[PDB]
């Protein structure tokens, strides 16, 4: 009984979190009404990690939905699995955050944060042994970015010895809502560097490129992008949701993936990614090749530009575990120049017999690569292009912020980049 408390904040955070609970609910045999109808005991072996058990053998996700406007969460409540969430776990305001990190972190968000923590506390008080928390959010908006990192700071204050984990969607000008997204992402990255133990970097550009070039989607939508994020979230959490010995909990995963506390930003990867030749069987060599291919990663960073500090790989489905080891060792031995040599045996492989829905087998990739600095470099460059002219700052100074706070967040993200560069050589 190692419970995880889930939190989803803002438009992006709630839309992706909704699909996540939809995908894993199907994998665990939970229907939209929280009733279990699976056929395998592996489905319920670790069901309490993400689900609470109510009267009548009902399973209720341990999820808290937060937003500063009602719209998106109204859609979730009307969505497919909307009825499965605890009604009291909907916490929302009416003002909105106007894609403004300051509104979510300092003004509008501050007015609502205490009520969110009341629900978090309630969910924690019922946990036999709470592992930690996982937050889904974007960094380019106001609520998920600004109030999301505010929640993290206060959750850390009240639960300082629990693990804080995030799925963070990074903005990209190719899939942009407002020009201030680099401002909001730089302010958030500052928070994440200090207050999270593990952060999966999901770049909206990578998701777009995959939908367009690989999946052959002419006009990708936010829905299409969220399918990739759903599948990736389900893959990286397999080790927590099913019986296993590798990275089986949040703290052990951090111990194996984070050699230095600030360098906890991961590149996730998923295979297969097939366009609609979708029925063809996928061999273990193919799964391994694609899973390590840059085109199958979702941070928009070329791994061959840096080195892997650590790697976690999860193979799902009924397959030759002997052939999995061989192919994993083949990838390391055929490209050992992209793995740091001062961390012996830094590639760990886990297997799970239950494959995702509609797939004979798949592989999920988790990399702590120094190439992630390219993602923070893009943000920093977009940040500086506007900040050198102080463009659009009035949205933030109007909420009480000072320019110095922008300079500090910028410097810290540039330090992070430099820190990655030193371990790449």
């Amino acid at each position: 009984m190692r419970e995880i408390v889930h939190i989803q904040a803002g438009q992006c955070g709630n839309q992706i979190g909704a699909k996540f609970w939809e995908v894993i609910s199907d994998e665990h045999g939970i229907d939209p009404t929280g009733s279990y109808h699976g056929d395998s005991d592996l489905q319920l072996e670790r069901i309490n990690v993400y689900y609470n058990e109510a009267t009548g053998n009902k399973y209720v996700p341990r999820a808290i939905l937060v937003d500063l406007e009602p719209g998106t969460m109204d859609s979730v409540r009307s969505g497919p699995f909307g009825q499965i969430f605890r009604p009291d776990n909907f916490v929302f305001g009416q003002s909105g955050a106007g894609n403004n990190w300051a509104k979510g972190h300092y003004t509008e968000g501050a007015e609502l944060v205490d009520s969110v923590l009341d629900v978090v506390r309630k969910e924690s008080e019922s946990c036999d042994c709470l592992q930690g928390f996982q937050l889904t959010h974007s960094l380019g908006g106001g609520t998920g970015s600004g109030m999301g990192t505010l929640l993290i700071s206060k959750i850390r204050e009240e639960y300082p010895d629990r693990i804080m984990n995030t799925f963070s969607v990074m903005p990209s000008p190719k899939v942009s809502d407002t020009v201030v997204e680099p401002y909001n992402a730089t302010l958030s990255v500052h928070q994440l560097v200090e207050n999270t133990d593990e952060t999966y970097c999901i770049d909206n550009e990578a998701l777009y490129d995959i939908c367009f070039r690989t999946l052959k989607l002419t006009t990708p939508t936010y829905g299409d992008l969220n399918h990739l994020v759903s599948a990736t979230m389900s893959g990286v959490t397999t080790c927590l949701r099913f019986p296993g010995q590798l990275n089986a909990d949040l703290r052990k995963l951090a111990v194996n993936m984070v050699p230095f506390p600030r360098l906890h930003f991961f590149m996730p990867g998923f295979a297969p990614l097939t366009s609609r030749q979708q029925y063809r069987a996928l061999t273990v060599p193919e799964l391994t090749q694609q899973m390590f291919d840059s085109k199958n990663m979702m941070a928009a960073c070329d791994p061959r530009h840096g080195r892997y500090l650590t790697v976690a790989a999860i193979f799902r489905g009924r397959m030759s575990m002997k052939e999995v080891d061989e192919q994993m060792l083949n990838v390391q031995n055929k490209n050992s120049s992209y793995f740091v040599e001062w961390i012996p045996n830094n590639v760990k492989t886990a297997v799970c017999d239950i494959p995702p829905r509609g797939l004979k087998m798949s592989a999920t990739f988790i990399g702590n690569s120094t190439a992630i600095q390219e993602l923070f470099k893009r943000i920093s460059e977009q940040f500086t292009a506007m900040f050198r002219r102080k463009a659009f700052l009035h949205w933030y100074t109007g909420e009480g912020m000072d320019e110095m706070e922008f300079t500090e967040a910028e410097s810290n993200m540039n330090d992070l980049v430099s820190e990655y560069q030193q371990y790449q050589d």
Partner: protein, 349 residues
């Protein structure tokens, strides 16, 4: 794509092997500290054998046999020959040798003096040579023992071949270098090409003070000898010329008069230590190139001088031998996508 690391930058032999391996386009060189290698071109001293063969999914091979030093050390070789029943103390192809520790430090001082006094009393030739891993040739035991005490390392005193076979014209001494390769299956391959490192000075049995005509080392002949390169280029005669000499002068062949004994000696040495160094049932595999040095007396009897565990090659023979090392030692374990240049010395494992 096979991977190898280089840990001995001063090895001319494996520098060429590494150069050849890369030329195949099927081998990639890794940093000397990267553990994910198929082949280690290891260092000469303190090679970390204990870290080999613990890499899941890599068949690991190294170019040195752990424990071969027993054969390639002046004092170790003497102890191995006297104590191994296969070689026995009565071995007929190794000069009467003794291990002598300096008095400032078992030791065969008295055993040597006993044999020495017997020769002195029997009017026999009593010239010995002292050396260590700085050489002194003398007929008085007092000078031999006093010379070793002035040093601080173990030495060996063995009989000096007072009747060496002298080439003509020149009346000059020489020694024969034979290159031997033992692969992971412990096959013993003798390179078809040897070299005679000859002295360009007439042999003089009445003066062991000038060591230029008695020591056939290439560095000594090229540094202290004044007839270097007079008879053969670089004081190096090869088997073709040397064989023709044996026919013209001695009406015999190199194979019958000398090579049979050389092959017998090579076999006896390596087979003796096979149980101690074989990697047959080991988690990693070994091969090694050996340099055997021989002496030929005027009776066409062959004597073993020493065994070198990290030999160099004759400039004219680097290309052929280094390629041969890749064919039978490296590609035999890691195949790529004749008329062998070796002579397999068959034996019972």
């Amino acid at each position: 794509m096979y991977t190898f690391v280089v840990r001995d930058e001063n090895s001319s032999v494996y520098a060429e092997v590494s150069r050849l391996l890369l030329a195949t386009g099927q081998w990639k060189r890794l940093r000397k500290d990267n553990p994910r290698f198929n082949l280690m071109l290891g260092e000469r001293n303190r090679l970390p054998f204990g870290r080999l063969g613990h890499e899941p999914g890599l068949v690991q091979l190294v170019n040195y046999y752990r424990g071969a030093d027993k054969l390639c050390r002046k004092a170790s070789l003497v102890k191995l020959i006297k104590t191994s029943p296969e070689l026995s103390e009565s071995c007929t192809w190794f000069p009467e040798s003794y291990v002598i520790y300096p008095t400032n430090l078992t030791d065969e001082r008295e055993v040597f003096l006993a044999a020495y006094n017997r020769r002195r009393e029997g009017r026999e030739g009593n010239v010995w040579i002292a050396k260590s891993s700085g050489i002194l040739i003398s007929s008085e035991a007092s000078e031999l023992l006093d010379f070793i005490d002035e040093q601080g390392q173990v030495h060996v005193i063995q009989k000096y071949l007072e009747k060496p076979l002298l080439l003509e014209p020149g009346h000059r001494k020489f020694d024969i270098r034979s290159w031997v390769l033992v692969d992971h299956l412990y096959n013993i391959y003798l390179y078809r090409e040897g070299v005679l490192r000859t002295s360009s000075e007439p042999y003089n049995s009445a003066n062991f003070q000038d060591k230029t005509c008695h020591l056939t080392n290439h560095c000594i002949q090229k540094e202290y000898s004044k007839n270097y390169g007079r008879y053969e280029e670089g004081n190096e005669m090869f088997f073709e010329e040397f064989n023709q000499y044996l026919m013209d002068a001695l009406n015999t062949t190199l194979e019958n008069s000398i090579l049979l004994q050389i092959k017998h000696i090579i076999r006896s040495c390596l087979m003796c230590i096979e149980p101690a160094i074989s990697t047959k049932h080991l988690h990693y595999q070994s091969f090694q190139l050996f340099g055997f040095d021989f002496m030929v007396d005027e009776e066409l009897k062959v004597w073993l001088i020493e065994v070198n565990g990290a030999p160099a090659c004759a400039q004219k023979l680097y290309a052929e031998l280094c390629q041969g090392i890749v064919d039978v030692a490296i590609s035999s374990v890691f195949p790529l996508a004749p008329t062998s240049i070796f002579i397999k010395l068959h034996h019972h494992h």
